[PDB]
């Protein structure tokens, strides 16, 4: 079926939970043996969210190459994404090592450091120009260059330096600051405006490594971001945009990381975002 009328048909019939449970039943199951090794317990935020072995990002290190991060490679859309958990106190150096090694231009953050009165990720970037951060375990230096605070999101320019080679690179930090502590946004308008700002920066384009996108577990809000981006790109590429099937795209993405889209409300929100976004594109 088309999307917008399939949407109204699920609303009128109140069957979002049944649609979402079908997706959960059909989703891929692949091994995640490296994630579960005892030496990696303090590298995982949640015991039930792990990268598959076949798609995990490897650190260029011979001691321990493990990080909780996955490469989502969308062949028809010609887009790739790295989805990862919010960094932990003992993985902030690994996080920036990955950004460096994978040649990423942009980092997309969809959570606040504290939500619901608890810490959802480490403070992993500097908040003042004159107070830079040094990660001694991976030999990197990170400096805040500029910050632009808007009503729904903040954009930061960062300088990442590999202290071993003295090479430097400019990284863009895109921080969506207004996702509610509970539920999903009422309107997709600010989320779509944010997606378009990331696109306009070059951070999603083939001349760079994959964008790094995270929330707390790296599957819920993060899944919504890449699902909406890929569906909108396919609607622009194909002769028949009504052939784009959001459930089929989501199942394709779940071949590369488990659990993408965590609730039926996030699934409905993803439909809404793609529907409204397709009208603005034209
Ligand atoms: C524009 N730019 C540059 C750097 C940089 C670091 C942070 C923000 C912006 C930056 C470092 C050097 C020179 C230039 C170049 O673009 C890259 N290499």
For the CA of 143, the closest atom of ligand 1 is: 7
Using CA atoms, how far apart are residues 5 and 9, in angstroms rounded to an integer?
6
Give the domain 1-282 fold: 3.90.190
User: Can you give the residue ranges of every domain in the chain?
Assistant: 1-282
Active-site annotation holds for 226: no
Q: Give the tokens for residue 76.
A: 């028809």
Using CA atoms, how far apart are residues 22 and 204, in angstroms rounded to an integer?
31
Q: In Å, how far are 104, 123, 218, 229 from 51, measured between CA atoms?
A: 19, 23, 10, 21
Instruction: Strand 79-84: give its sheet, edge to edge.
Output: 56-58, 66-74, 79-84, 211-214, 106-109, 167-176, 153-162, 140-149, 133-135
Cβ–Cβ < 8 Å for 213, 173: no
Q: Give the tokens for residue 184.
A: 């999903």
Cβ–Cβ < 8 Å for 179, 269: no
Using CA atoms, how far apart are residues 88 and 93, in angstroms rounded to an integer?
10
Using CA atoms, how far apart are residues 42 and 57, in angstroms rounded to an integer?
17
- Asked whether residue 220 is marked as a ligand-binding residue, the answer is yes
Give the pocket of ligand 1 (CB within 6 Å).
145, 157, 159, 168, 170
Nearest residue (CA) to ligand 1, atom 3:
170
Q: What spacing in Å lies between the alpha carbon of 146 and ligand 1's midpoint?
A: 12
Cβ–Cβ < 8 Å for 49, 257: no
Using CA atoms, how far apart are residues 173 and 122, in angstroms rounded to an integer?
15
Q: What spacing in Å lies between the alpha carbon of 171 and ligand 1's midpoint?
A: 9
Using CA atoms, how far apart are residues 64 and 94, in angstroms rounded to an integer?
10
Using CA atoms, how far apart are residues 215 and 194, in angstroms rounded to an integer?
15
Q: In Å, how far are 4, 7, 45, 122 from 87, measured between CA atoms?
A: 37, 35, 8, 6
Nearest to 228 by CA among 195, 179, 254, 260: 195
Paired with 156 in beta bridges are: 147, 173
Helices H, strands E: what count in the chain? 7, 11
- Asked whether residue 148 is marked as a ligand-binding residue, the answer is no
DSSP state for residue 70 in the 8-state scheme: E
For the CA of 158, the closest atom of ligand 1 is: 7
Q: What spacing in Å lies between the alpha carbon of 157 and ligand 1's midpoint?
A: 10
Using CA atoms, how far apart are residues 23 and 105, in angstroms rounded to an integer?
32
DSSP 42-86: GG-S-TT----GGGEEEPS-SS--EEEEEEEEETTTTEEEEEEPP
Q: What spacing in Å lies between the alpha carbon of 160 and ligand 1's midpoint?
A: 9
For the CA of 157, the closest atom of ligand 1 is: 8
DSSP state for residue 46 in the 8-state scheme: -
- Asked whether residue 215 is marked as a ligand-binding residue, the answer is yes
Could you give the angle at the alpha carbon of 175 between the alpha carbons of 172 and 179, nearest 5°? 160
What residues contact 14, with CB distance under 8 A and at least 6 apart?
Answer: none
Nearest residue (CA) to ligand 1, atom 17:
169
Way the structure was solved: X-ray
| Marked catalytic residue, from 121, 215, 226, 231 | 215
State which of 155, 159, 166 you would mutate to test the pocket of ligand 1, scoring each by most atoms of that ligand within 8 A of its C-beta. Answer: 159
Q: Give the tokens for residue 202.
A: 């070059």
- Asked whether residue 181 is marked as a ligand-binding residue, the answer is yes
* Torsion from C-alpha of 228, 187, 258, 8, nearest 10 degrees: -80
Nearest residue (CA) to ligand 1, atom 16:
170
Using CA atoms, how far apart are residues 70 and 83, in angstroms rounded to an integer?
5
- Asked whether residue 61 is marked as a ligand-binding residue, the answer is no
Using CA atoms, how far apart are residues 88 and 243, in angstroms rounded to an integer?
41
């Amino acid at each position: 079926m088309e999307m917008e009328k399939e949407f109204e048909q699920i609303d009128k019939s109140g069957s979002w939970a049944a649609i979402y449970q079908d997706i959960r039943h059909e989703a891929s199951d692949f091994p995640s043996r490296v994630a579960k090794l005892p030496k990696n317990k303090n590298r995982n935020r949640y015991r039930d969210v792990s990268p598959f072995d076949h798609s995990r990002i490897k650190l260029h290190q011979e001691d321990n190459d493990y990080i909780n991060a996955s490469l989502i490679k969308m062949e028809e859309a010609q887009r790739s994404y790295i989805l990862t958990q919010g960094p932990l106190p003992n993985t902030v150096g690994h996080f920036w090592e990955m950004v460096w090694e994978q040649k990423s231009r942009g980092v997309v953050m969809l959570n606040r450091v504290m939500e619901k009165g608890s810490l959802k990720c480490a403070q992993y970037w500097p908040q003042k120009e004159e107070k830079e951060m040094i990660f001694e375990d991976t030999n990197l230096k990170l400096t805040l260059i500029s910050e632009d605070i808007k009503s729904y999101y903040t954009v930061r320019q960062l300088e990442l330096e590999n202290l071993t080679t003295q090479e430097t690179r400019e990284i863009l930090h895109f921080h969506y600051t207004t996702w509610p502590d509970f539920g999903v946004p009422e309107s997709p308008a600010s989320f779509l405006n944010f997606l378009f700002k990331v696109r306009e920066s070059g951070s999603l384009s083939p001349e760079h490594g994959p964008v790094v996108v995270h929330c707390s577990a790296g599957i819920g809000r993060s899944g919504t971001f890449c699902l909406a981006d890929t569906c909108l790109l396919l609607m622009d590429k194909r002769k028949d945009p009504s052939s784009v099937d959001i459930k089929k795209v989501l199942l394709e993405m779940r071949k590369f990381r488990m659990g993408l889209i965590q609730t039926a409300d996030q699934l409905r929100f993803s439909y809404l975002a793609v529907i409204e976004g397709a009208k603005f594109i034209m």
